[PDB]
Structure 1
Amino acid sequence: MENFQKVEKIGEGTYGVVYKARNKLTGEVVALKKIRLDTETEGVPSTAIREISLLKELNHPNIVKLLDVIHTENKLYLVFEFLHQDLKKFMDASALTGIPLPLIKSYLFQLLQGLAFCHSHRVLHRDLKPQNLLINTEGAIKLADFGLARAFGVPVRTYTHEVVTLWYRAPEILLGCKYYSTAVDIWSLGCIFAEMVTRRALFPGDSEIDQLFRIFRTLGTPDEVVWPGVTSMPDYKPSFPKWARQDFSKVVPPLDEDGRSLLSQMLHYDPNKRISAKAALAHPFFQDVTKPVPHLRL
């Protein structure tokens, strides 16, 4: 740990603080995930055990790489490849001018590839959101922070006490479904995809119920026909208002047909019919995808 020089804090954490560091011997810039450890009196954290373990198996150009794990006495450090900034910061800078559609496409494309890699390696990310996606100046975007990640060799039981972000949480999880599925991750990208297009958060709920209602208000309230089983789900209710589905050309106007097509399939209600990363990559929306570079402010 002595060959590292901390440069600045680039992210707070309940799991750990992240610092931009530098390897004093090789010159390599890296991101250090420092873990409390000395506290908790409960040994090594789960998010640490799962992030390290699962990430060591995932080597993809669209997933931040885990370079090393330095565990010792009371300190456990995760050494990661470093990237200039996250998508949240980028979307902000882009507020006035906005992100060009070719870059939005490029980003969605790569995300779907990284995610498709996770899924075909039985790993669910579960916390896809703008601040968990990193980008560089050459046009690359990568999935990061596999703290809430889960391997699903066997179906992953859903937490009773919601952990994932609210705004990008899939409707299944809100309705109280039993297990997670690769579907929850595609829903998140689906939400991120629209946000890039509209410059606005698609379903910015205040509470679990406000979240569920914003989704319905936009995509219409689900029923047994659209999603067999809805009405039976734990947290579903008959007293739920019956809203009508809105025309996607009013939700995401800047998008063409292929665009509205993909997005609707990514935000498909029944998680057995919601498009997969693998399948989305073959959608015509990507027939002309390229790798544009973004303009990033320090």
Structure 2
Amino acid sequence: MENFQKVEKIGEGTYGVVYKARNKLTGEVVALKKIRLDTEGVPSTAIREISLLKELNHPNIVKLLDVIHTENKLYLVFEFLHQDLKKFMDASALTGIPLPLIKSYLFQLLQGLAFCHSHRVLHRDLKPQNLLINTEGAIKLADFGLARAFGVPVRTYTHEVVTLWYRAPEILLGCKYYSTAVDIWSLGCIFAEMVTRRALFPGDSEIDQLFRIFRTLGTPDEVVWPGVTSMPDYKPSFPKWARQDFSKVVPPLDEDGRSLLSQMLHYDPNKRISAKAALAHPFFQDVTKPVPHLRL
């Protein structure tokens, strides 16, 4: 809109392009998301779906400040946070993020997710790029509720590929009515990634993604994942790999963290820990809120 001066492109929200922008009236600087319209103006369904998001406010959810549906168009105006977790991970790769700060971030996000999930909202696409951090030690969920309202192309507008690395295996095997558990999976993968400084399952197509998972956790079967063999894209011809021990997967994480993670990465989404229950895990008995060394 004319109310906003674009200061810089900071991202893509797979549907939309996101800009740092300055409110010409209120001086506030904001993240401005302009949603790519199916051109099929804006489905009215989608509008009332985004409306609900304006009320889903939490210290660990990036605050949706306004939705602007005017003339053709749909813009989302969020509070601006000064970087994503991906850049901090990148910046931290040589020394590794301190464990107490890993823990604070995991904790905080579990609080975000516990809140969302308690309102039957799923993120569905958690990744380091959709997690935003500030200088005070907050970490916040972003870029969600978008994906319910419209369906997103994989090549998107910007021609960059969609990241699969954080996809739960039920989604990959073709389930439609998957659950809050998908986000716990994605968060486990990020958790591992913060701890190791390497992505856990950096697949580059759906089957590579799924076989990377199989390789580390074992090919799923009916013993560990009752029902798995009736899922839409499950093939009896999947290679049958044996499970790694987690001690190989995320050294040198301590037994509590490792145990937490293995429950976040349970194949069966029903045996996968919830966000609420994860908060009560012994790993957070010594949880603190440290200050990050940022590079703004």
- Above 0.5 in TM-score? yes
1:15 Cα deviation from its structure 2 partner: 2.3
| More displaced 10-residue stretch of structure 1: 263-272 or 54-63 | 54-63
CA distance in 2, matches of 1:157, 1:283: 39
CA distance in 2, matches of 1:140, 1:239: 45
CA distance in 2, matches of 1:12, 1:76: 15
1:50 Cα deviation from its structure 2 partner: 6.8
Alignment CA distance shift 1:94-1:157 (3 Å): closer
Alignment CA distance shift 1:21-1:48 (3 Å): farther
Q: Provide the TM-score with structure 1 as the length reference.
A: 0.89
For the 8 Å contact 1:52–1:66, the answer to whether it is kept is no
Question: What is the SS of the residue equivalent to 1:69?
Answer: strand
Q: Identity over the aligned pairs, expressed in percent? A: 100
1:52 Cα deviation from its structure 2 partner: 2.3
Provide the residue aligned with 1:265 in structure 2: 263
Q: Deviations over 1:211-258 (max 9, x none)?
A: 111111111122211111122322222222222211111110021011
For the 8 Å contact 1:124–1:152, the answer to whether it is kept is no
CA distance in 1, matches of 2:158, 2:6: 38
Name stretches of at least 5 consecutive residues in structure 2 with no aligned partner: none
1:3 Cα deviation from its structure 2 partner: 4.2
1:168 Cα deviation from its structure 2 partner: 0.9
Alignment CA distance shift 1:30-1:171 (3 Å): same
CA RMSD of aligned residues (A): 4.2
Alignment CA distance shift 1:238-1:46 (3 Å): farther
1:116 Cα deviation from its structure 2 partner: 1.0
Q: Deviations over 1:181-229 (max 9, x none)?
A: 0111110001011000010110111221111111111111222111111
1:17 Cα deviation from its structure 2 partner: 1.9
Q: Deviations over 1:42-84 (max 9, x none)?
A: 2216896376223212110000111112222234322111100
Q: Deviations over 1:7-57 (max 9, x none)?
A: 22211355222111223443322111123559xx32216896376223212
CA distance in 1, matches of 2:24, 2:271: 50
| More displaced 10-residue stretch of structure 1: 90-99 or 21-30 | 21-30
Q: Provide the TM-score with structure 2 as the length reference.
A: 0.90
Alignment CA distance shift 1:46-1:16 (3 Å): farther
Name stretches of at least 5 consecutive residues in structure 1 with no aligned partner: none
| More displaced 10-residue stretch of structure 1: 153-162 or 90-99 | 153-162
| More displaced 10-residue stretch of structure 1: 13-22 or 243-252 | 13-22
1:101 Cα deviation from its structure 2 partner: 0.5
Alignment CA distance shift 1:200-1:287 (3 Å): same
